[PDB]
Amino acid sequence: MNTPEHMTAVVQRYVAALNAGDLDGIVALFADDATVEDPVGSEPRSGTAAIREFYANSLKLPLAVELTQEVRAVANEAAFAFTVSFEYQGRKTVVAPIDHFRFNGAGKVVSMRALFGEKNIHAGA
Amino acid sequence: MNTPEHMTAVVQRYVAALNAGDLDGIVALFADDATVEDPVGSEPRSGTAAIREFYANSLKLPLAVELTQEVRAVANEAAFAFTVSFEYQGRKTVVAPIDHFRFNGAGKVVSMRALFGEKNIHAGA
């Protein structure tokens, strides 16, 4: 029923790839017809095309994600929480959204939805 | 409407209702035909019968749930992380499951699901 090592490992490899800016790879990370939602209720994308479109418009910003908690892998599920370092307009900020990925088939992510709150961000300079 | 302020507040009320171990209350909190899906295993139950039945069989354990992180109120759904204090006759253990459920701004929860795991469990003396 999906392992935490494989799942979590995927999340890890994904994070790295993310910081690497590997869109193609990141895309290959999950299904090809999967649906990503970042942040939330902000028009979810579907298909390596969309997934890439978003992930791209996202990376568009020079940020650095890093784990500061852990991952919540369960029934073909993997809901982990990570931080996002980004600074703009002489204003630094660090978010801590939660990525919720659901694997299907056996270990293929076809659905990905994040969870970011207002108090999940910490501005500063 | 929909906000993290009201949503979170609701989450808080629920937790309290949880710790207090008030099925009648917790039940009166969310819908009456809602569906509970906690922790995991792909087996959600609908109705105050299955709901209460579970929440009861759960509370059956003298534990004390309490937040120790934050709440992620997004997508008309609150997704926070809390801990659960419980001892095993001489032993001690504390879990840190994630509560994620959807509802209408006001506490109109008709669907809820948690996400736990072994790593979420922290044994000890």
From Swiss-Prot, chains A, B:
GO terms for biological process: steroid metabolic process. The keyword Lipid metabolism applies. SUPFAM superfamilies: NTF2-like (SSF54427). The keyword Lipid metabolism applies. Its EC number is 5.3.3.1. Changing residue 39 to A: Perturbs active site geometry and lowers activity. Keywords: Isomerase, Lipid metabolism, Steroid metabolism. Induction: By steroids. InterPro entries: Ketosteroid_isomerase, NTF2-like_dom_sf, SnoaL-like, Steroid_delta5-4_isomerase. Coiled coil: none annotated. Substrate binds at residue 99. One of its GO terms (molecular function) is steroid Delta-isomerase activity. Homodimer. This is Steroid Delta-isomerase. It comes from Comamonas testosteroni. The gene is ksi.
